[PDB]
Design a protein around this ligand. Structure first.
Ligand SMILES: CC(=O)N[C@@H]1[C@@H](O)[C@@H](O[C@@H]2OC(C(=O)O)=C[C@H](O)[C@H]2O)[C@@H](COS(=O)(=O)O)O[C@H]1O
Ligand SMILES: CC(=O)N[C@@H]1[C@@H](O)[C@H](O[C@@H]2OC(C(=O)O)=C[C@H](O)[C@H]2O)[C@@H](COS(=O)(=O)O)O[C@H]1O
Lengths: 750, 741
């Protein structure tokens, strides 16, 4: 099971077609597009395009190839010619090879030595001297010089050359020999082992070559066999961290299996979300983290890493057997391990986690009508094979599972006092507690009667208030909560008496959403203004709000995993809370959730251990025990320095930088230079944009300082002296980079 | 046809539920959400939530109502009480009425005088004395004091009070009288005329009240009748600029029609795009521009303005009679007014503009389409396939390639008739002539005299009014004349490097000027004098890669690029750009994806569908609001009213002149314009008087930074231009005094 992330125009990409992908010594990703050259550092895009007035820009917007050498230098192949990105000066060095009047296009770049480069043109092959910054055309033999090369690939000593019609050739650097290997055009060359070389071709298919025996094996497409490759037109080959072949074709993605000798086809699917963005793959690259990048012709980019595969989403698909409405309320698991999902505008859904099937119930024009399509509460009478439904603006609905008939109760037909049932819980005696917007109602199922509660077990007037949630603890006590607040009760038969066990606090008068009893006996209550715990042993309440590390105050539901940690649904994502450390691990929509905003009663933990959180745009389901840790902690790269908000450039009038800010070890600031803001980045693609930075200015700052949403640090009016800036990198999972990034700052007298 | 714009969580809004909407003097929109109070100016949200460590933050996040009064003071109702946003100090003044140990919630706010407010609580009705910041509870008569009010609505002198169970009341400010007008909960009250009053109720439907006759008419929902209202549970009532009533209910939106006495139901539709975000409409408000704002319980906000309603998008709908693939190539209209639409991965599509019927052809990547109307044949050019002939009357397809026929290349990109009876075929290698009567392919290699034809990739073919052939591709462009079956190079273009550029399209304008679209901009050719003028991104073009050119009725041109559509006026050389946010299929468009019907309708395809519009039917935005200076920093530290810097005592928008001391050298000035029609597509013009030599223009940013200025008095000035390019003649002024050092 493999799903992709999407990076396209809306993400900051210049043009959808990604011809070539590479990574530099800094860790930044490089993408060659039909319109521009894109640099991605894990947070922001840096689009490089041609300027007619500025010579420092790239030669042309149409780039076709990108290759990084041994030294870490980035080389681009444009229509106008060759261009190198100078990191030190943050500029482009444009080179042109003019023949017969026009400058020739660069199709492929390959390294011969740290001082030499192999360049392929639509007219032949030429060598570029790096040290002399000039092209040499009188270096190759006549047969080699006029060879039209479509692809270039190096393996240690030998560089393999794929041509348009002449098949395959090889070139030794030491011996300087040009020999054939032995109709169509070659697009990609990749070697698995000294006995296995894979060759991608235009319509000729795939070829496995054993150069030791010179034996060849062809792979073609047949429409009858789905186990074969999808298309004969292939243009990209890559190896993953798990030592597997990745095949990018004109149609779909192919992955070779060693044992079965077959291929797995991964297609562009609009229905099943998470699938490939476009059908035509053109470039595949593995970063240092191991994450696979797929460059398509129209769909932008596709990222995949096993660790980032964390959350699964369940949404409505029109004209398909799927969820009815995206606005999800209560989720209840029965004895059959099925889920009774409630919705706001779609009715009641019955979902089988194995069979993927959905069974809906809606309002009918009079017998299978459920009163209202706005479900809030669900209870399963497993012994009687009945389901009790609580709907907003409808009342109580009783479903007979073995016939499908529905009994409806409201204010006009029955003695029910309120048509808005929000919570259903068994009394233990046989009846049911009904949490409505005005009062609490007891329902006798054997008598079909509604009893409004107005008195305690001593005749203490029960305030007519809003009831949204009901909970029964291990000590068989009833918990009643709503907007008015929380309350605790005992049950002396049918009568209820308030057992005041909570200490006097204004939190008992808070908008109550949910109550959960943890495995350690501690009671946890989630309200609209944070959440808290209740330890009855000593009678204490510890409150937890946003300034404690919580993403949002409005907590809709709490769930406990195998490790004792608590999972919370808010208006701004899901939070993982460890009561011992009192720390938070937060997840947002960008991490893979249905939406940052979640909904009331939309929390469910299965008997197996799976968690289900519903919101406004569907349900997010995951296994907290199965979630993978990110082991990668990349160094911090300082991307930008601004003086008085204006960006400091190398060799600019300020004269602070002559090298790039990334290259700079120390900066000297003159008397008139008082304000500056430093922006930094971390190249973590698994964690993505969820990273913690620790900064400190040695000599000025007393302690370290932490950043979770920001990346820029501003300082002003510093005293004279020599200071040091340090910055550490924590990933999403909380692992640190021990050795920080250091840039010295020298403040001159005033 | 009514379509909405979407504003929600991803747009910057704090929480999806919008209970009430209002607007302030400055033009900022105010939204009361279940979590926080949202302030929107047209560019960014300012979210106000509670802080336990700051007493100048809104008392509670749970906001129920927002109300702006006579003087433009913003009042919020929270679960803790009543809060006012002080504009002059950019703070929040929180007030709490305490009864029985608990602070009471404010459910509704109404203005009595510029010094008095009627406040409704879940326990009765109290008053708030503005000038004295105190609640007065012994002010009203015992009957009025204990009245649980659900909605408040003032009409001139009278304030109409809708209760939860006890019906409707009216309170005159002059006579201090409190009497019932004439069973369920009233949620909204609105007066259309002195004879027409609309009442929204919770489950009791809708009521039309004529107070002069005391006659009442009830409107209820009938499930069998789709003409009636959607639901009985109603909560919002608003009138638009065209004098129409907008009714927001628990289910769907209703719009009253005067003549038929019926209602138009607008539902939440996942299939049809542009529709309502969520079924339940909570609040409806009309801005100063006339645009309608709709607050939903779960979907956020829905904006509608007829002027902004420019584009209709046609996309692929799975399991539905629609477009096959969203990546669209060439589009051709036949004599039957129908559209032959080519796709990259869905084959070929036939579309009826009136019937909405789609017809898809699969293999069981189209790039060229030509219609033979006389023989009822359709010629198809495909990539990695060749040439395909379709008989419209049988449905049989005859396809040709390199392996079966004498065709040299399987990648046909352009088809154009030769005039004799044959067809020109533009392929990635050479040009081929195809005889339809003989079924033979002839590769062109020599000219009329015998000049060798270079093997280059051909992408486009064009015929002008003078019957000349135009050949364009990656190698460049070339002009030819026909001497029978032979062709001669007629070099009418002057010697220029523009001839050797990646060509995409050629179009002859009605005036006779030839327009060529390249990947490096576009240019015109006037044969009358043989002069070429180039236009690129520095001239005002959104992107250099031009895919298609079309002319409208006025003489303007419409161009598709990688960054939207541009409207070019050759007379003034001015550009009018459009992006995805304006309502396009996508910013990126595709090659050959341009079509103008005989009617005048334009069609542009891209990577995410097709966008259709009528350039003559497009409305201009006539609003040019003043610039409001949002924020001021000092060394990237935000300057606050009455702060330690001492620069601001009023708000930055309130302040007309500031004085900067010797050690206060660096600052940044943020500004905004509230144009909800133009959205985020605006142009700012700034200049500092006495320092800047000229005016400078901004389109992306709104922040201007200065540093180390000399001593003396300077004047900052800023103007506002809408998406259409209309200017605000009067600039916003802020005086800056720099002290000697
Ligand atoms: C470089 C290569 O192998 N093929 C070039 C490719 O662009 C050709 O056709 C395009 O193929 C694809 C694709 O998925 O790769 C998409 C387009 O639909 C199709 O045009 C042709 C055409 O190139 S063009 O300049 O984009 O028109 O050229 C091949 O060399
Ligand atoms: C104030 C009013 O007229 N009705 C209150 C409802 O807003 C609350 O229920 C929600 O109503 C709606 C809606 O479309 O307006 C959607 C949502 O699904 C319902 O739960 C109701 C309970 O309040 S709460 O939101 O649960 O806190 O109280 C009604 O009085």
């Amino acid at each position: 099971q493999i799903t992709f992330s999407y990076i396209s125009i809306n993400e900051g990409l210049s043009q959808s077609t990604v011809f070539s992908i590479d990574q530099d010594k800094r860790g930044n990703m490089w993408f060659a597009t039909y319109d521009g050259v894109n640099k991605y550092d894990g947070y922001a895009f840096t689009v490089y395009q041609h300027n007619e007035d500025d010579p420092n820009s790239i030669a042309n917007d149409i780039s076709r190839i990108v290759k990084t050498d041994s030294q870490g230098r980035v080389w681009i192949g444009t229509r106008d010619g060759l261009s190198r990105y100078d990191e030190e000066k943050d500029i482009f060095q444009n080179f042109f090879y003019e023949k017969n009047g026009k400058h020739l296009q660069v199709n492929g770049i390959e390294e011969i030595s740290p001082e030499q480069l192999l360049i392929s043109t639509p007219e032949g092959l030429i060598m570029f001297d790096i040290k002399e910054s000039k092209f040499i055309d009188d270096s190759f033999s006549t047969a080699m010089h006029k060879t039209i090369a479509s692809t270039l690939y190096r393996q240690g000593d030998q560089i393999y050359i794929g041509t348009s019609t002449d098949g395959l050739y090889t070139y030794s650097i030491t011996q300087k020999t040009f020999e054939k290997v032995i109709t169509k055009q070659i697009q990609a060359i990749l070697q698995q082992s000294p006995t296995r070389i894979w060759v991608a071709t235009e319509g000729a298919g795939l070829f496995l070559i054993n150069p030791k025996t010179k034996e060849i094996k062809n792979y073609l497409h047949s429409p009858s066999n789905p186990k074969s490759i999808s298309s004969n037109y292939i243009r990209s080959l890559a190896m993953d961290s798990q030592n597997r072949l990745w095949i990018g074709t004109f149609n779909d993605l192919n992955i070779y299996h060693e044992g079965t000798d077959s291929f797995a086809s991964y297609s562009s699917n609009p229905v099943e979300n998470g699938s490939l963005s476009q059908r035509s793959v053109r470039s595949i690259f593995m970063d240092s983290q191991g994450g696979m990048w797929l460059g398509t012709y129209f769909g932008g980019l596709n990222y995949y890493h096993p660790i980032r595969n964390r959350f699964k989403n369940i949404r409505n698909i029109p004209y398909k057997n799927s969820l009815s409405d995206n606005v999800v309320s209560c989720i209840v698991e029965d004895k059959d391990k099925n889920l009774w999902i409630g919705t706001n505008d779609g009715g009641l859904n019955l979902y089988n986690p194995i069979t993927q099937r959905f069974t809906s119930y809606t309002l009918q024009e009079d017998a299978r009508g459920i009163g209202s399509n706005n479900i809030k509460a669900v209870y399963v009478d497993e012994k009687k094979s009945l389901v009790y439904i609580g709907t907003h603006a409808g009342g109580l609905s009783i479903l007979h599972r073995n016939s499908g008939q529905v009994e409806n109760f409201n204010q006009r037909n029955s003695q029910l006092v309120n048509e808005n049932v929000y919570a259903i819980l068994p009394d233990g005696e046989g009846n049911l507690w009904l949490g409505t917007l005005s009062a609490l109602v007891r329902f006798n199922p054997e008598q079909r009667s509604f009893t409004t509660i107005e008195k305690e077990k001593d005749g203490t007037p029960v305030v007519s208030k809003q009831i949204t949630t009901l909970f029964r603890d291990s000590h068989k006590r009833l918990w009643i909560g709503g907007e008015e607040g929380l309350s605790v009760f005992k049950q002396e038969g049918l009568d209820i008496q308030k057992a005041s066990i909570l200490p006097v606090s204004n939190v008992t008068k808070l908008f109550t959403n949910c109550i959960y009893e943890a495995s350690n006996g501690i009671i946890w209550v989630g309200t609209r203004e944070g959440f808290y715990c209740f330890n009855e042993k000593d009678k204490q309440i510890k409150r937890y709000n946003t300034t404690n590390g919580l993403p949002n105050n409005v907590v809709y539901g709490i769930l406990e995993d195998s490790f004792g940690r608590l999972w919370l649904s808010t208006n701004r994502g899901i939070s993982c809370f460890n009561p011992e450390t009192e720390k938070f691990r937060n997840f947002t929509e960008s991490d893979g959730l249905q939406s940052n905003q979640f909904n009331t009663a939309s929390y469910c933990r299965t008997s197996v251990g799976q968690m289900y959180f519903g919101g406004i745009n569907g349900i997010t389901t995951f296994r907290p025990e199965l979630l993978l840790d990110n082991p990668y902690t990349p160094p911090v790269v300082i991307t930008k320095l601004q003086l008085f908000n204006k960006v400091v450039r190398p060799d600019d009038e300020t004269g602070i930088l002559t090298k790039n800010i990334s290259e700079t070890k120390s900066i000297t600031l003159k008397s008139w230079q008082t304000a500056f803001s430093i922006e930094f980045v971390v190249s973590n693609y698994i964690s993505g944009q969820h990273n913690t930075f620790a900064y400190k200015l040695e000599g000025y700052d007393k302690e370290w300082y932490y950043l979770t949403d920001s990346r820029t640090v501003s300082y002003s009016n510093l005293p004279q002296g020599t200071y040091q800036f340090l910055v550490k990198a924590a990933n999403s999972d909380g692992k640190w980079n021990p050795i920080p990034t250091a840039l010295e700052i020298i403040v001159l007298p005033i």
